[PDB]
Amino acid sequence: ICVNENGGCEQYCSDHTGTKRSCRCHEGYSLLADGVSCTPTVEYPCGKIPILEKRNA
Amino acid sequence: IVGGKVCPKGECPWQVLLLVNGAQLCGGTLINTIWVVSAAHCFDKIKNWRNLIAVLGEHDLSEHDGDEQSRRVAQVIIPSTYVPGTTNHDIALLRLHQPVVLTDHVVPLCLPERTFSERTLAFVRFSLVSGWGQLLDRGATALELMVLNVPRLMTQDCLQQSNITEYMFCAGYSDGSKDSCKGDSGGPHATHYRGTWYLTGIVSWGQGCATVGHFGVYTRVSQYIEWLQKLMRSEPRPGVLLRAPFP
Ligand SMILES: O=C(NCc1cccc(-n2ncc(C(=O)Nc3ccc4nc[nH]c(=O)c4c3)c2O)c1)Nc1ccccc1
Numbered sequence: 001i002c003v004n005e006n007g008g009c010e011q012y013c014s015d016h017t018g019t020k021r022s023c024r025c026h027e028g029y030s031l032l033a034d035g036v037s038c039t040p041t042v043e044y045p046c047g048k049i050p051i052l053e054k055r056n057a
Numbered sequence: 058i059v060g061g062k063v064c065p066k067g068e069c070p071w072q073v074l075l076l077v078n079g080a081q082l083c084g085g086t087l088i089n090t091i092w093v094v095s096a097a098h099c100f101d102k103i104k105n106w107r108n109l110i111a112v113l114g115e116h117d118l119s120e121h122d123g124d125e126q127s128r129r130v131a132q133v134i135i136p137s138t139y140v141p142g143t144t145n146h147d148i149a150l151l152r153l154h155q156p157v158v159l160t161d162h163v164v165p166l167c168l169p170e171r172t173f174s175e176r177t178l179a180f181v182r183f184s185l186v187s188g189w190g191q192l193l194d195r196g197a198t199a200l201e202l203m204v205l206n207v208p209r210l211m212t213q214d215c216l217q218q219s220n221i222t223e224y225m226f227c228a229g230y231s232d233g234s235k236d237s238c239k240g241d242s243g244g245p246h247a248t249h250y251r252g253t254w255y256l257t258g259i260v261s262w263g264q265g266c267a268t269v270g271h272f273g274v275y276t277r278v279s280q281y282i283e284w285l286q287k288l289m290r291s292e293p294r295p296g297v298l299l300r301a302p303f304p
């Protein structure tokens with residue numbers, strides 16, 4: 001599942017036994033109830049550019 | 058960087074400048090508050106390992122604006138398989154003496170999981186490379202941080218359109234107009250996916266900056282994720298230089 005379309009995950013993806021998939025997020029993010037999206041939990045999460053994030057906030 | 062543009066201040070917040078005795082040595086990438094990824098070859102000729110400094114939040118080298126944060130380098134970790142003066146396994150993990158403080162101008166780039174990087178990031182065509190390196194082959198270095206969008210090649214296609222191992226990849230242009238350059242080694246090749254940027258390559262070195270018929274050679278970071286993660290969980294050891302087994 002993870003090999004195709006990143007398994008639908010925004011960030012990381014793990015295959016499980018059966019038709020099962022689990023998405024995960026990097027430290028400083030949490031997984032939303034959709035099971036795929038990652039949202040920051042800290043002020044300066046990795047891989048985001050503050051001056052551009054505040055420019056669209 | 059040849060044929061790029063100035064990275065607007067704060068838009069490359071993971072970029073590191075490495076200095077030896079105050080002089081520009083190489084670039085680097087912040088991946089956490091105390092960890093920087095760079096290129097092993099940057100440290101081949103270091104005599105006094107205690108005069109190495111990492112600078113975060115840098116932009117214009119001609120001035121001090123207060124966003125810069127300088128740290129001593131406490132550890133330089135290189136793979137056992139790296140041979141000085143060569144391209145294969147050209148990666149170094151640097152531990153800072155004290156953490157940097159994250160700010161609008163200082164932010165880590167995400168070190169991706171290996172599976173994610175291989176299955177997904179490796180197929181994103183364009184990525185950003187940056188540094189204060191030479192603006193031209195045989196030219197002066199940049200005073201403002203520069204950035205360039207480069208396309209990645211499959212290793213089969215690099216060899217056709219032009220050795221190159223599974224620990225490297227090719228990216229950039231063969232017409233001599235746009236490339237990474239001397240002074241940029243160790244800097245990030247950063248890849249965007251669904252709103253977040255990830256470390257996919259390190260500026261290494263080939264046979265020449267902006268050489269017609271040749272692409273830029275980058276260390277394939279996905280091969281080193283597990284190696285880096287294990288080292289980041291380890292305790293520091295006396296003596297700055299550490300050679301660590303690879304794999
Ligand atoms: O002397 C040793 N280390 C010192 C030390 C430190 C820092 C920089 C360097 N250093 N010297 C030359 C370069 C260089 O041309 N980099 C470069 C950057 C971007 C590129 N993009 C596209 N295509 C390229 O070809 C390319 C090349 C570099 O980075 C050396 N080792 C050594 C050991 C034994 C024998 C010879 C050399």
Ligand SMILES: [Ca+2]
Binds near residue numbers: 116119121125
């Ligand atoms: Ca400055």
Ligand SMILES: [Cl-]
Binds near residue numbers: 106
């Ligand atoms: Cl030492």
